[model samples]
Each structure stands twice: as C-alpha cells, then as structure tokens.
Target: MKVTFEQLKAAFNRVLISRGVDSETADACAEMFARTTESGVYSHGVNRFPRFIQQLENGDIIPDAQPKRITSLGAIEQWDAQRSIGNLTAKKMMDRAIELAADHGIGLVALRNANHWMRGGSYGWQAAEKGYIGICWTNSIAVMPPWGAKECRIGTNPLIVAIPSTPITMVDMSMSMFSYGMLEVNRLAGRQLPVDGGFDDEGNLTKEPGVIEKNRRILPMGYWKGSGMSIVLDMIATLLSDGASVAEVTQDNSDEYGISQIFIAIEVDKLIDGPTRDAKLQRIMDYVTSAERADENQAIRLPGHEFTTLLAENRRNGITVDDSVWAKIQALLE
Candidate 1:
C-alpha cells in the first residue's frame, strides 16, 4: 500500500507521544523521519522506526535530554548530546553550525555521547537547503572488520557531503560497500544484492544477504582504502568530540550508543554569487556527465539526480512501504 508523507509522520508522532515524548520533539522527529522516507531512504526512515521504539523503551535513548555545549573556539564548538534523541541532536548541532557559518566562513560542531543520527544525509540536505555547503560524519559500534582480519574492529561510519545546487548535490555513503541495514532490508525482501557486499563464512566474496548477516562481516567500499578511511574518520571524531571510540563503544557488547559526530557548514554565498556559483557548477557537472557510457542504452546520472527524481515522483504519487515493515509500525500503536 502507498501512504502520503503527512500520514506516515502523523502515525509516528502518535506513537512517540504515547511514549511520553513532548509534542514539539515528537513533531520534529516525525518530520525528519518522514522527510527521510520522502527522500527515498526507507532503511533509515519508516523502516527503522520499530528499532527506534525498541531503543527508547530500553532507555538507550533519552527523549527529554537536551544537548549542551561543552566549549567553543571561534567557529569550532564541542557539544555533549547527553544521549538525547539522535535526530533532534543532529538537527540542533547542524543548525548551530549553520548559524556560526553565517558569521564566520565555516562552522564546526563536534557532538559527544550522541546516539545514531538515523539518516546522515538529512543534515546535509538541511544545510544545502539553506544555501551552504555541509559535511558531516558519525562513528558507530564495530560492525565491519578492518582489512585482513575477520574480527570486527571498525564501524560502518557514514560520511555525508552536500553542496548547494538546484536539487542539492549530496553524497551520503557508508565505509562499507553495503550497510547492515541495507543487507537486512534485502534479506527481508528475499532478494540478492546487486553486487558483492560481503564474504560468506567459507571466505568467498558473495552477494548472499543471509550469509553476510550470519557472519556479520560486511565488505569495505574500496577494500583497504575504505578500511583505512573508517579508522581515520573514527579517530578524528573521537579526538574532536572527546568521546568513545569504536573499541570503547563496542566493549560492553551493547547496542550502539554514546557515539561521536561532527557537523560542518560553509557559507557558499559569502564566497561567490548564487548565479555565478550555479553556472560554474553546472558546467562542471555537464562536463563530467558528457563522457561516453559503456552501455549505449544507459544514461549517466549525477550523484543525487536519481534521488531527486524519486522524491518528486513519490510526492506526486505516494511512498511505498513493504507490508511487513508497515505492519510492525502499525502493531506498535495497538
């Protein structure tokens, strides 16, 4: 069945309010979740709500806790999220960064003891919509192993970058070739991954979602390169936020919590006029896409072009949710 964005958000808000969340916070979270689905990332949108409710019930996330600033150094600031709702804290930090960017050329906000931010691209899109350049990343509990070792030692740590464009040029990706969420989604759908995502227990790279889940060994996006980058990104977030690293967070064998994140925004308008910037960016984009395609029938697309198209289509029609996923969310109300 298909549902409108407003309907989905209202359902989420109802459930969240029943759990003692304030109306303002519940509304904010609902909107963010709905917008994520509208943007075509179901894994972190409606599909993830059941897990979110589980964490809330288990007290892994505190609904009323407000993020507080730890210290500030010009455009750079450190904050303690105090285990608040991840989406709220992330939005708050990014908004603060945008404010600082308006004054300074750039703003950097580091958040410690934060929960999962759901869709990292949400913050990027928020910044881009405000006509600024945004870059953000978060560290997670160990889920992917570093190169050459089977034991999990690194987080799938996602990074997002967004530049102000017509439809927003946003690049959101995990260090892993496929996120565990994506793997689970595929497994539930009884489908195979389009590409090799992980190694089977027998040590051969395979696209079998079930095999990858059982072993819990996801492949890095570019092998050793992704492995090294994940480590460096984790270290950077830890140092900046003075928060737990992947090793410390995973030590208790608990679900991912108390993570570190960083949000940065740059004032694009301060450097160039909007029209000039757009024209130059368009030229660059056109040149990149003009390259000959390996398949004559296939047309090349920019990083976020498809998602933009999907968003428009879904809004015109309605977003589709798997029956099982939708059922779980509905069951929560009962």
Candidate 2:
C-alpha cells in the first residue's frame, strides 16, 4: 500500500486529537511520525504508531503532561519530563539546547523520566536544520543481554549525532546489531537480515528475524565492545540526568517509561564561518569515500546518505507501507 506524507500526517493527527492530544502537539507529533516514514524508517514510523497509542491508553503516556526544568548551570541544564509524550519532550529539550547554543558555543540538556523518543534522528535533523551540530542519546529498559550473559541485562540504547552539512550528516543507531523494532519489521515482511542480528534458541548467531524476536536474544553491534559501550552510555545518561538506569527501568516489566536522555547542540557559526567549515568537512568525506570498493556492485555510502535518496524517491512516489499495518491504523481511527 502507498500513502502520501500529508495523508498519513492528517490521519495520525485525527487519531491523536480524538485521543485527547491537543491540536498543536498532535500536529507536531503527526508531522514527525510522517517524516520518519517518508525518510524510509518505517520501523519507527507507522509500524510503531499502534504501540504508541496502546501505551497512551494504558496510562504509560500523559497527553497533557509538561516537562519541568530542574536546574541549570551556564550552558548545561536538566529537566523532568513528567511522563509527557517522548517525541514532544525530546523536541522541546533540543529546542532549548539550540537556544542555549545560540548564546554559548555549546548547550547540553539532560532529561529524566522521558518516554521513548520514537526516532532519535528527528532531533538531529532539527538541530542541523537550524545550522547547529546535535548529539543526543537515550537509555531504555533492559532488552539486550550483556555480551557474556544468557539473559537480558541492558537496553539497546541508541545514540545519534548530526552534523550541519549540505544534506546533513546524521548517524542514529542502537548499540545492538539490530533493534527489536527492526527485527519485528523484517519479520513482518518475511525477510532475512543481511547479517546475524541475533542468536537462535540454540544460542548460535542467526539472520532469521523471527527466531531472534521469539527468543529475545538480540546481538550487540560488536559483541563485547557494544556491551561495554551500552553499559557506559546507560551510566552517563543516568548520572547526568539523575534518572532511572537500565536496571531500575526493568524492575517493573510492565512497560518501558520514565527513561533518561541527553541532548547537546553546538552552534557552527560561533566556531567558524561556512566556506572554510564546509570545504574542510567535504574534503574529509571525499577522502573517506575515495577508497576502492570491496564489492564491485555495492556503492560506498556515508551514514544517512541512503535516507536522503529514499526521502526524495518516496516523496516523488507515495511512501510504501505494509497493508496490515495500514489496516491496523485505519481500524484505530474508525
């Protein structure tokens, strides 16, 4: 099935408004969700919308909640999300960070008690659109097992870094080799992962998404290295925001909420002018991409490059989505 960006946004907005989300917030939420789909990230877009709505109905999300500032020190600040919509909370905090960056060269904003931020790259693009560099991350409930462990002990916490470039350089990724969402998406499409995404019941690495999803044995990006990084990231987000850690978040097991996140923005203009900075960045990119291709048929692409092409293609043609997913969303509104 195919849907236009505006069509999807309007449908999402209608459902949100019916569910008591205010007009302004619903609009923003719909647009962000639509943009995620348009950019070829269906796992975080329409595919995840029903789960978001489920969380809302179950009281895990508070439609009318607002974030409260906790404290501030120069360009760094902290806040409490108060169980609001994660997407909105994230956007507001990033906006605040950008405001601070306008004054100082850098701005750091830590948020506690936030819900899932949906797509972390949205904030990255937000900062880049404003001509600023953005770095952000979030810690989730335990979903991935520690490298040496047989059971889950850490979140597949994601980190995002965005540079203000011609097409923007955004790297958004989870510590895991594959996110649960991506696994589910692939499973739904009846496809195999390009690489070993997780372990099967026998504890051997497998590319079958369904097996991984069923067993919940997700693999870290680089095995022990990714496990170590996930631990450190969880520590940083917890300590910086004074919020829930992975261990604490997993205690309830009912749902994942009240997580912690951090956002930082740097004003490019404050550090250097455009021509010099752009040329320097381009040269570096050119050098990196100049390497001979290991696979003759494969094109060497920088991080987030495919998304640019996907976005343009999807815009020209309508965004493609699964029929089942589309039906599920329509059923909700009906």
Candidate 3:
C-alpha cells in the first residue's frame, strides 16, 4: 500500500500517542520514521515499527528519559543515553557534536546504554546539511557470526559517514553483509539476496533470506576485515562509554537493549576555504561518475545517490508499505 508521507506520519503518531508517548515525542519520532520510509529504506522504517512499539510496551525504551552527561575532555564527551528513544538521543548528541566542532573543528560524543537507532544515516545527513562532516556508529547485540565462527558472537555494528556535498555524500552500513532489518525485509518480500548474505543451516553460503535469518550466521561484509572491525569498534565503544559490551547485550537472547553509540562531526571549512572545498569535492564526484559504463544502460551512483533519488520519487508517488504492517499499526491505535 502507498500512503503520502503525512498520512504515514499521522498513523505512527496516533499509535505512539495511544501507547502513552507524549505529543511532542510522538510527533518527532513519527516524522523521522516516516521520512526514513519516504526515502525508500523500507527495512529501517515502516517495517521496524511493530518492533519499536513492542520494545516501548516492554519498557526497553523510555519516552521521558534524557541523556545524562558522563564527562567531557576537550572536544570529546561521554554520555548515558538512559535508553531514550534512539533517534532522538542520537540526534541530540549529533547536534551537540556539531556545536563542539564549530568551536574546536572536531567533536566526538560517545553514548552508553543507547537504543536501536533506525536509519543511522539520518544523523549523518543532519550534520552534512548543516555544513559539517558527520560520523556515527553503534554496537548491537550479537547478531552475526565473526568470520570463521558458526555461532553468532559479534554485532552487525552499524556505521555512517557523511561529507558536506551539494546533496550530502554518505555511506551507512553494518559490518555484516546485510543488517537484520534488511534480511527481514527481503524475507518478507520472498526474494533472495543479490549475493550470499549468510550461511544456511547446513553450513553452506546462501542468498536465501529466510534460511540465513533463521540460521543466524550472517556473513561479514569484507570477511575477516569486517569481523576485525566489529571487535575493535565494540572495544572502543565499551571502554569509552564505560558501558556494556556486545557480549553483555547478547546475554538476554529474548531482549536486547542498552547498546552503545558514537557520534562525531568535523568543521572541515575551518581548515579549507569554501571555494577550495567545493572545487575539490566536485572534482572527485565528477571524475568518478564520468567513468565509462560496461553496460550502456547501467548507471554509476555515488554513495547516498540512491537516497536522494528515492526521496524525490517517493515524495511524488507517496511511500509504499506492506499492507499487513499497516494493519498491525492500525490495530495498535485501536
């Protein structure tokens, strides 16, 4: 089913409000969630709503909670997200990081006990549009098997990086070949992944989303390289935040919360003048996109290019969502 962005936001707001979320918090959360769906990332947007509501009802997320400062040193700070709404807490920290960057050229904020931040790209885009380079990452419960292992013992470990371009240049990814949300999306669509995303129950590489998801042996993006990053990122986040590790988060297989995250923003213009910065960015963009396509019909797309295209297209055609998921949300409001 397709619904205009406003309608989708309203539906989300109604459900959230009915579930005891305040008007302002519901409005803020709904709009961001709708915008994520509107940008064509169905995985992290509408499809994740049922789980979001479940977590809220289960007391894993507290609407009234706010981030508490842990400590600050120079342009770096540590925070406790207190299990607040993930996106809002991350957004607040990202904005604060941008503020620090304005003064010191670079800022970093580490958050402990954060929640699942849907569409990590949003924070990056926020900083980029505000004239700063942005980066953010988070550690999740063990969802992927470290390269050589059969058991799931590492995080999908999402990361995002954004540069201030005409239309922000950003890459948002998880260390795993595909995030759990993406796998669930594909499974729901009854489609196979374009590449092998994980292992089957029989221990063979597979593109079948259902089998891989159930098997819980997702492949790391760059094999051992991705496996390596997950461990290191987990270390930094745990030590810096003085918070729980992936192992700790994975302890309760039935429930996952109290994750850790980091947000960073850089004021690149402080070092490079405006004109020079623009020229350099444009030069790189132009050169890469001008390359010859092996197939004449194929298009070369930069990071975040698809998001820009989809944002415009969905704005025109309305956002598409699964009918069953829509019904589930409607049931909540009732």
RMSD of each candidate relative to the true structure = 1.6, 1.8, 1.8
User: Which 10 successive residues of model 2 have the least lDDT summed?
Assistant: 298-307
TM agreement with the true structure for every prediction: 0.95, 0.94, 0.94
Task: Name the top TM-score candidate.
Answer: 1
Cα-based lDDT at residue 230, candidate 1: 97
Per-residue C-alpha lDDT of model 2 across residues 112-186, encoded as one tens digit per residue:
989999999989889998999999999998888999786999998888999998778889989999888778778
Clashing pairs in 3: none
Candidate 1 C-alpha error for residue 169, in Å: 1.0
Compared with the true structure, the alpha-carbon lDDT of candidate 1 equals: 0.90
Candidate maximizing lDDT:
1
Give the alpha carbon lDDT tens digit for every residue of 52-168 in model 1. Answer: 999888888999999999999999999999999999899999999999999998999999989999999889889999999989999999989998877799998889999898768
Against the true structure, candidate 2 reaches a TM-score of: 0.94
- Ranking of candidates on TM-score, top first: 1, 3, 2
lDDT of 3 at 150: 93
The digit string of per-residue lDDT tens for model 3 on 217-286 reads 8889988999999999999888888888899888953477899898999998878999999999999999
Question: Candidate 3's C-alpha lDDT?
Answer: 0.89
